[PDB]
Design a protein around this nucleic acid. Sequence first.
RNA 1: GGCGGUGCGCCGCGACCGGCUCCGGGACGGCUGGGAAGGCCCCGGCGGGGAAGGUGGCCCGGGGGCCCCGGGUGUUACAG
RNA 2: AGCAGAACUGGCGCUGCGGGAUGAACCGAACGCCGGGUUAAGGCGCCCGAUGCCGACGCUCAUCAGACCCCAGAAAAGGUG
RNA 3: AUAGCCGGAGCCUCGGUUGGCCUCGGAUAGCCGGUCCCCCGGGGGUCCGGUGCGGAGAGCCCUUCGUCCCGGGAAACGGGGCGGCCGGAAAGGGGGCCGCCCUCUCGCCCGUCACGCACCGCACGUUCGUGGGGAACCUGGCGCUAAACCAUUCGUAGACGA
Lengths: 108, 176, 138, 199, 109
Amino acid sequence: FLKQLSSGLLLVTGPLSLNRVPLRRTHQKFVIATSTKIDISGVKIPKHLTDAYFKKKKKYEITEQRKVDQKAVDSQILPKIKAVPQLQGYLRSVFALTNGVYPHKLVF
Amino acid sequence: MKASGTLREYKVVGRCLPTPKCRTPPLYRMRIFAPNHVVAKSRFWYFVSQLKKMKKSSGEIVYCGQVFEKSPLRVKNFGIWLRYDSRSGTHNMYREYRDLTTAGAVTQCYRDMGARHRARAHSIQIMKVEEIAASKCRRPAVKQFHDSKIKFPLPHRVLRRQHKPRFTTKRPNTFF
Amino acid sequence: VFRRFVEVGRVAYVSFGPHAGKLVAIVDVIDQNRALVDGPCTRVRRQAMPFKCMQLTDFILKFPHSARQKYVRKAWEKADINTKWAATRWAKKIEARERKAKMTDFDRYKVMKAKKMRNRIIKNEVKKLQRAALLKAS
Amino acid sequence: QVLVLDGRGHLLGRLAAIVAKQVLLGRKVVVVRCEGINISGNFYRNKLKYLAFLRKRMNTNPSRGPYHFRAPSRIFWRTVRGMLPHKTKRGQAALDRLKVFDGIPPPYDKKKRMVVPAALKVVRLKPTRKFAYLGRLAHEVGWKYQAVTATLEEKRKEKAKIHYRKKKQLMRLRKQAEKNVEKKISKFTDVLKTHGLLV
Amino acid sequence: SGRLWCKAIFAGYKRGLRNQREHTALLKIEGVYARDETEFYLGKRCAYVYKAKNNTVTPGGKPNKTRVIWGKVTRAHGNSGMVRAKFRSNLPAKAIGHRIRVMLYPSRI
RNA sequence: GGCGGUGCGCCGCGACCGGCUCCGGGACGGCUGGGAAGGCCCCGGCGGGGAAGGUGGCCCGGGGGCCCCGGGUGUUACAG
RNA sequence: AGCAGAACUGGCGCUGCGGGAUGAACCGAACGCCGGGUUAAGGCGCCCGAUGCCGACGCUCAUCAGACCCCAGAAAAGGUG
RNA sequence: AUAGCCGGAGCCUCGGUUGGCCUCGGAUAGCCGGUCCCCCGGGGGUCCGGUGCGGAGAGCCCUUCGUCCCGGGAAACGGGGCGGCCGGAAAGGGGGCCGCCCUCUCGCCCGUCACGCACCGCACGUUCGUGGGGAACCUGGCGCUAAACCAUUCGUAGACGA
């Protein structure tokens, strides 16, 4: 999670190398909030990207501005998640429920 | 009177209304065991109407209050006298209990008498509860706890929380 | 035969109730299914607590059958029950349960990754000894 | 996904009441060793309880009367059927999920059997009371395969003992395996102890 | 790559002994057996997945044979972990004792 | 293109406000016998007493053999 | 006598609903069509919604045990259970 | 005895499900596992450890984002390819072992490099699924060239059937 946008959606972005997830909006209700935090206090989010930047325009091809902003933000995050051991493997993994696993019983 | 939950001891006093004949009537105090004070004053007028020429219309409540246990952390032996009713005839008893509070022993008395003689709480008229020493006890069930070196295990521990593991693998162990 | 006995001064573990998970020491026995008990050092005020919600331990500290709360605390500190209880295998597997209970999803992933190679070495170690046994069996 | 419940030491009505609720919830329940089911009360009480049940038959045509089942598995199947709405479509669909067996079939011998602690004699009955075995009760009223099942159940008793004694030796090598290798597994061991798995 | 919903069994409708109210469904979610553990599942969206003969459309995919009845978890029922749910259309009685899914995306955490 | 009105083809989602409900978490205060009890200050200090569910100490018995279990006297003695 | 004849009041007749396995008279409560919530009487092992409460205290073994107003079955007497 | 068995793709219909646990016996005023110094042909006995079971179902096993390189830890016995061999009868498994001609320390855990429609917030997603059944299409191999009934007769049988 990066920041709270204007309309209430969450600007959430895992690294594209690990999660294969771009700078993408996500509603806060359909979100499991894991109590695992990194320090993004010292990153520089671009001000030009906003809710209107992620608004659907009208076949989707990736613009070169999206690619530049993808590596502009990931370059600040990816060194920081490498400071926490086994965090990149945690992000590459997928979340699922197995036998005997109950979300109400476990904490996260 | 419904012996609901644990009982409470209420100290209710009362007197007759002032009359042209009598300036100030005498004051009568009693020990009333009841769940609340509303049923305690009703039970107060029940016994007062038997002993004296008193009714609730001609009388009044001067002070209705609850007295607390003076030593609730001291284990004590209580002697309790009974005036219950049976299906045929009425009988008196003396019963011994071992409890921390006087009201708890009366509560233990009400649940014990209904268990043994099937006597309801409306058929039971409590009269006297008194603290007695351990050396003056009579019933051997109470006197068997008067031991400075009392020692006993828990032989057959009936296991609870039996349904949280409703289906399990290992046979449960009823021994600890 | 029985090895644990309800008696004056035995340290007990509370099963359920508002004081569940704490230690407590028997002072006196009130009734057949209820006893007067006092956990002066474990935030358990002097009260009556039945045999239903207590698991009795193999710890005995000596004081008279109706000693006040001052002497129970002094006997608790003299015997030093709190340090010895943490060294008991009973409490070591008790405290591991909330460690599993508070285990974070990130902590859940690291346990799963560590469990993989830990079982890999043991299975590889076990594999070396099954084949080593059969040469020794022939 | 299939409940394999061992019937030894289980009370007839307490097990049947829990099975009937689980079966109605779309769960397939297989009850095994129905000869080990035992009933509270003395043996002579339950015999006339079943003998007077035998007397209840249709006068005009006993072939249409109550079908008195003598096998321990079918006796337990009968008391579950009386705990179910078997006159409806969903009651009969439930009974298809129930499967009772005397002894242990070779489909279910090499499987772990679940135990219901709430439906147990040692939990729900006082030690001074008397109980009656359904296996003894069945053969004493018309079942012909008590000694038959006893020998076949005897046959698998040491066959599982061979598996179990091999199982102990198999994991005896496993427990001894860590004893040589703590120096290179302590990295994985300590993180499994901080989260409470080996403490 | 795996399951994202908790397993629940449609035990039956909210009912009396001789009167049933089939506009409210009772759910038995696996793993919950007490009233105080049902608080997490309150407000979660429940769905009954089933398949039919005629092909119907699928959002974001080729039209399939599967169909759903959407609903939400309203409030806890009973004492032993049961819970009530309300759907847009009333559940058919063919689903009695069958598996339905309760999802987590109506999350309060 | 902007403003007002009506509506979205179908399947859906979200946000805020108001009404009616069920539930939870915090903090504040009154009354009592102006709580009862209870904790600390050597047993709070001093003096005077009492017995028992009898702690030291004494005697007898038994188990190894230096602690435990019983019975009796006692008044704090190395517990109360 | 579930018989016949009276007094007060309430019901059925004229009235459905929840409960008592069923039920003219019992208990609760009377009715336009619905959604949410909460109850009465009754209940909460399964049928059958609800205790899968770490329910409290005791009593009771029946080789005819016992289990809820109406209400559907029992007496005198006796028991070193 | 049967005028089907082995192995490839598409179409209708029936539906449920969304990782597996491969197992001692048995007690409940008692158990469990190891040492066997002891005694006999597996049991008994002793000892040592746990016993609110941690050689714990409050549990165990597997874990799957994928591809490309490089380095570290393990591994050299190991991962995967066909024939036999036996162990299974209460309603019986593709279970294990011997050798095979090819396969890599690729398997896995840590860390580097780079890539993968980044479908621009949204639902039945994700398996068991080469699921069961049915027609038709495939390719070849291996094969088999039967019975029942009616009719007639019999009369150990019979209202008619049988």
